[PDB]
Amino acid sequence: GQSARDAERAKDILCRLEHTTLRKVTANTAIYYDPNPQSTVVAEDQEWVNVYYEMPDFDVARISPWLLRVELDRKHMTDRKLTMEQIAEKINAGFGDDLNCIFNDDNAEKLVLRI
């Protein structure tokens, strides 16, 4: 289609065809220890995890004291026109429901989602 003419649609189908894994869009990861979701060992993630916490869902059996924190690079994120919403559903939809992902808002400069 006109995708053969304009470079933008060519580049979007380019990114849509190329294979992309997770370690290409991550900056660093850290395994913390929050025995309570209100503990928030790292200093500043308390805001968004809390604004989730006043809407608390899925406290079915326990709360796992073990946490996994992932940091993302918006450079590698936007170049493929990705944002952590689709990642968030597919990292859940595709592996099971044994994991649970809460995330920031992209207006914040660094893109972190905790599991």
């Binding site: 289609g1 003419r5 060519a10």
Partner: protein
């Protein structure tokens, strides 16, 4: 690699169009995607075309690749030789290589395999 069209007045006009080239082959899926030309898309591996497209497609692709490797340095070789080679190479239905165990599986006599 241009897109040559025949205009309304009847002249050959060439057009520049974006093409994409990959490193790795799985064509049956790449053909099934949207806004990707399913006619002119091809791969430089011929067992893949054999499994995906057929046997005549292997004949023509092999001919094309032989022509492209021959005419790389401006040389030239007649057509009958390419046609005869790529016809006797895919005559018994499947791809038998001109190799040790490719000439070793035929109705040929006993005094030739000795």
């Amino acid at each position: 690699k241009k897109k040559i069209i025949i205009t309304e007045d009847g002249e050959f006009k060439a057009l520049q169009e974006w093409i994409l080239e990959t490193d790795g082959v799985s064509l049956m899926r790449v053909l099934s995607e949207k806004d990707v030309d399913p006619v002119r898309t091809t791969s430089n591996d011929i067992v893949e075309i054999f499994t995906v497209l057929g046997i005549e497609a292997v004949r023509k692709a092999l001919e094309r690749e032989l022509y492209h490797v021959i005419s790389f340095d401006g040389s030239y070789v007649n057509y009958r030789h390419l046609a005869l080679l790529c016809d006797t190479m895919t005559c018994r239905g499947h791809l038998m290589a001109i190799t040790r165990h490719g000439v070793n599986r035929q109705d040929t006599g006993p005094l030739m395999k000795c």
